[PDB]
Design a binder for this molecule. Structure first.
Ligand SMILES: Nc1ccc2c(c1)C(=O)N([C@@H]1CCC(=O)NC1=O)C2=O
Lengths: 232, 178
């Protein structure tokens, strides 16, 4: 006969998958899916990792728990440090589901850049965007928060778009570190995303680095490690 | 006559309805706190001076029902769990003193949850309060921003990028993983 605690846990996981049922998908990564919904009268998104069919079920649960926990800690750390990122409403550790504020009407930095590149023909008018991202990631690193997955898809521009209101998202791979090497690798992931997703925007990444360097008093060793990890 | 209550279904627990009742000029808060401890009054008796928005209560209640169905509550009852969830800390005794009511209080927010055959006699509950029920539109006149900012230790970084409510919610929703 079944343990009541196990039955209650399965009934919670059934509740969660029922809630996700008819929801529209707004983002997808390797492991995670993000759906748009409503949470107690507020526009919300819900992030979940569905078990992959070729992995042991307990390994999937461990992975889901670890990344959900890390992302909830990172989002709290952002809010208390004044780094703009989604508010956390609720974290369901029975199903490893994260309910967050929807950043309504926003466009990714990725889409904003590619749009600008297609209308304009030059990255000239992206300097202020680069400087803003520099200031934001400088503040994040000064809190010793390593994002873990900095791409132009994980930064949102909250309307009105031309105000350049950057909101950071997707902290499932984040961790806390003061080591310049970890901050250097974080930046390198972002450099590689820029170079490969936005070819011929080197001057944009250059302005990003200049802004980062003047915004953080700890940037100098970080940029040295960026040089080093690129080589290795 | 009574239509001053504020009721919401829980999105994740569709069978559950949360009700909020707000009272001013309460003269028997000592009795009410004793009765809650003796289980002879339904609901969570909450200090409304530190509640900035009904959303704050609904987040607390959602989490309390969740843990309650899992059998994993931090406190002994659903009513105490709702109150504990409002606090920014994991100190249970501190939460219940700062967010619950004392005999010193003259405003009270009663929160209760119904589901299925578990129903509250709302008229009888209201009759137990020696005070004046008011609409929740009155909550901004009762809430004390100074006191809220002290309890939640909200700083200027937090305030620079959103509302006090959003910072409070963020604190409440992640304190179980510190
Ligand atoms: N981790 C995440 C946190 C919050 C959000 C996302 C991911 C995310 O994909 N979105 C989109 C942005 C565009 C829009 O208008 N609504 C969304 O839902 C978010 O708002």
């Amino acid at each position: 006969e079944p343990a009541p605690e196990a039955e209650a846990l399965a009934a919670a996981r059934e509740r969660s998958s029922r809630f996700l049922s008819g929801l529209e998908l707004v983002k997808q990564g390797a492991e995670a899916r993000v759906f748009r919904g409503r949470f107690q009268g507020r526009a919300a998104v819900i992030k979940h990792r569905f078990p992959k069919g070729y992995r042991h079920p307990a390994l999937e649960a461990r992975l889901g728990r670890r990344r959900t926990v890390q992302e909830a800690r990172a989002l709290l750390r952002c809010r208390r440090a004044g780094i703009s990122a989604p508010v956390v409403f609720f974290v369901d550790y029975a199903s490893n589901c994260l309910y967050m504020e929807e950043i309504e009407g926003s466009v990714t930095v990725r889409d904003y850049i590619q749009s600008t590149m297609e209308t304009e023909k030059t990255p000239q008018g992206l300097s202020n965007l680069a400087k803003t991202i520099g200031q934001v990631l400088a503040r994040m690193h000064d809190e010793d928060l390593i994002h873990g997955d900095l791409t132009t898809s994980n930064m949102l521009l909250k309307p009105p778009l031309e105000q350049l209101n950057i909101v950071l998202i997707d902290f499932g791979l984040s961790f806390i570190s003061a080591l310049p090497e970890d901050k250097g690798v974080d930046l390198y992931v972002l450099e590689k995303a820029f170079l490969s997703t936005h070819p011929n925007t080197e001057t944009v990444f250059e302005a990003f680095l200049k802004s980062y360097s003047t915004s953080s008093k700890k940037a100098r060793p970080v940029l040295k490690k960026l040089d080093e990890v690129r080589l290795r | 006559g009574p239509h001053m209550q504020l009721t919401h279904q829980l999105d994740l627990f569709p069978e559950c309805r949360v009700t909020l009742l707000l009272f001013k000029d309460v003269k028997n808060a000592g009795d009410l706190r004793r009765k809650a401890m003796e289980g002879t009054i339904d609901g969570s008796l909450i200090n409304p001076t530190v509640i900035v928005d009904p959303f704050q209560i609904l987040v607390a209640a959602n989490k309390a029902v969740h843990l309650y169905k899992l059998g994993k509550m931090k406190t002994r009852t659903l009513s105490t769990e709702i109150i504990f969830n409002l606090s920014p800390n994991n100190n249970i005794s501190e939460a219940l003193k700062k967010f619950g009511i004392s005999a010193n209080d003259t405003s009270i927010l009663i929160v209760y949850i119904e589901e299925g055959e578990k129903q509250i006699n709302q008229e009888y509950l209201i009759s137990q309060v020696e005070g004046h029920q008011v609409s929740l539109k009155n909550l901004p006149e009762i809430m004390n921003i100074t006191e809220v900012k002290k309890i939640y230790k909200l700083s200027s970084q937090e305030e620079s990028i959103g509302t006090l409510l959003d910072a409070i919610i963020c604190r409440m929703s992640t304190k179980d993983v510190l």
